[PDB]
Design a protein around this ligand. Structure first.
Ligand SMILES: *S(=O)(=O)c1ccc(COc2cccc3nc(N)nc(N)c23)cc1
Lengths: 287, 288
């Protein structure tokens, strides 16, 4: 299959991680962002390769010997995400900037964060497309169609589905208007309970993965402002599973049962890119 | 050019890292360990490939977004192959990771199951005492508040080589004895916690010229040793332990104790345990 465009002219390498074996490239085609990621190893096809005669070229020796391996097509998979046409929100996002941590009080959110957010963030159209089945229908793992307490559990774009090691699914709620953790009140408890339980039971049916192998969380300062819950394999150090962003659903539910006004009043901690205008707005508000 | 042995029989997958695109395999030969790692991308070769006609297979398409499966030529298909032959059990022990299971411990679970289990296994924290009474690692103290109750000792963690700030990792050990974990914290510990957070950070700013907003300051629930200690790490340093299933931010810990005094005695804490952990079974059995 052909790319959604014709020809690529690299403009800038937005991000280049040697540790995560990923590259984010901005190119002119019109504007387009192409993400290439080396796929994780599949135990079966590797074990099968080592039992035979592989193509190796020695780098160095010792007991420690290093080689350069050239495996056949099957092992040569690369995850290719194409964003076309890509907006200025996309080009700024993927860029590597130093991060600074900020502690947002209930008043900081009301006065600084919420008005900034309302000034606008991103199009959520792809979310709507999933929810109204205009896209990815074939990939829905489970759906509770209830307009208020309902959701859609779909594997995330970031998971190639070839192995359970990096299992990553999202529960996207059917109800519109819940931007983040900050909009949550006790009226959202039946929705959240539905996600926690029905989302895990769906993973158990589909992937035979017990709930104690799952890390179920929300992100504070999410990438998109339509409530979504992450379901990640525990052995997977999922970028974003870190304490400065992740909030366990079970704990979110429990806090809400304890303190109804919790997420509206309490101070939330998150990181922001040094170049983020919101970071300055909060910094200035705090001094 | 070839292999140091003849034939491979995979017995056990020692370690996996789907984020690092690496695999650790123990296999029987002629005992050996083969490490396979996907090689990083080369901007040039990739840019050159996208300007032409690549072999792509669509996974799906949604709005402006679309995912594919790419099969590049030989030049992009390199895999780093480290071979350890012959292999011994201590290497098999340093290279094998245990399967983890998550558990949600209620206040009552801790009181009835966790605490009695902890008390059963007589664990020595003599090395901690040695630091505190300066019998060991005196030369490493970055900062010390000597107050017997509200005081602490700030020491760089031994894994941090101190040659760069990128992986800055310090630990504060409190002078006061008897605070095993997060579960022992009450509002009486607020002056100590406030000193650890504010003094610890001020010391890091003076010593390392690292502003507080570049620091992730946390506690571990189910710590490796049961004498209260807080971690001070560089924010850009993403290395497990900073994950939500274990880390608890000191600032948040303080705020919780200001709101709910009885918080850490009553509330349900979530953490992971190694599948072979006797405590994991004890909690599982208690819960059903
Ligand atoms: S990026 O290219 O890394 C990138 C951009 C946007 C998003 C938001 O997520 C999706 C966009 C479109 C479809 C989609 N479908 C599923 N199943 N899951 C997600 N997460 C997305 C992600 C990555």
């Amino acid at each position: 299959v052909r790319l959604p465009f014709s020809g690529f002219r690299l403009q800038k390498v937005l991000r280049e991680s040697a540790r995560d074996k990923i590259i984010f490239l901005h190119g002119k085609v019109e504007d387009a962002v192409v993400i290439l990621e080396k796929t994780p190893f599949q135990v079966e096809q590797v074990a099968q390769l080592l039992t035979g005669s592989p193509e190796l070229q020695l780098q160095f020796s010792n007991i420690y010997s290093t080689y350069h391996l050239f495996p056949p097509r099957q092992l040569n998979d690369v995850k290719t995400t194409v964003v076309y046409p890509a907006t200025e929100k996309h080009l700024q996002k993927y860029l590597r900037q130093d991060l600074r941590l900020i502690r947002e009080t209930g008043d900081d959110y009301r006065n600084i964060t919420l008005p900034h957010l309302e000034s606008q963030s991103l199009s959520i159209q792809w979310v709507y497309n999933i929810l109204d089945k205009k896209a990815e229908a074939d990939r829905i793992v489970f759906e509770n169609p209830d307009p208020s307490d309902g959701f859609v559990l779909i594997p995330d774009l970031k998971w190639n589905q070839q192995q359970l090691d990096d299992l990553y699914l999202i529960a996207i709620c059917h109800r519109r208007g819940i931007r983040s953790l900050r909009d949550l009140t006790p009226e959202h408890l039946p929705l959240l309970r539905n996600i926690l339980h029905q989302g895990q039971e769906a993973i158990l049916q589909r992937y035979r993965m017990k709930g104690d192998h799952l890390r179920v969380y929300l992100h504070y300062l999410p990438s998109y402002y339509h409530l979504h819950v992450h379901f990640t394999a525990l052995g997977f150090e999922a970028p974003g599973s870190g304490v400065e962003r992740a909030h366990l659903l079970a704990e979110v539910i429990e806090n809400l049962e304890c303190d109804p006004r919790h997420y509206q009043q309490r101070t939330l901690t998150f990181a922001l890119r040094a170049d983020d205008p919101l970071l300055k707005l909060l910094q200035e508000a705090q001094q």
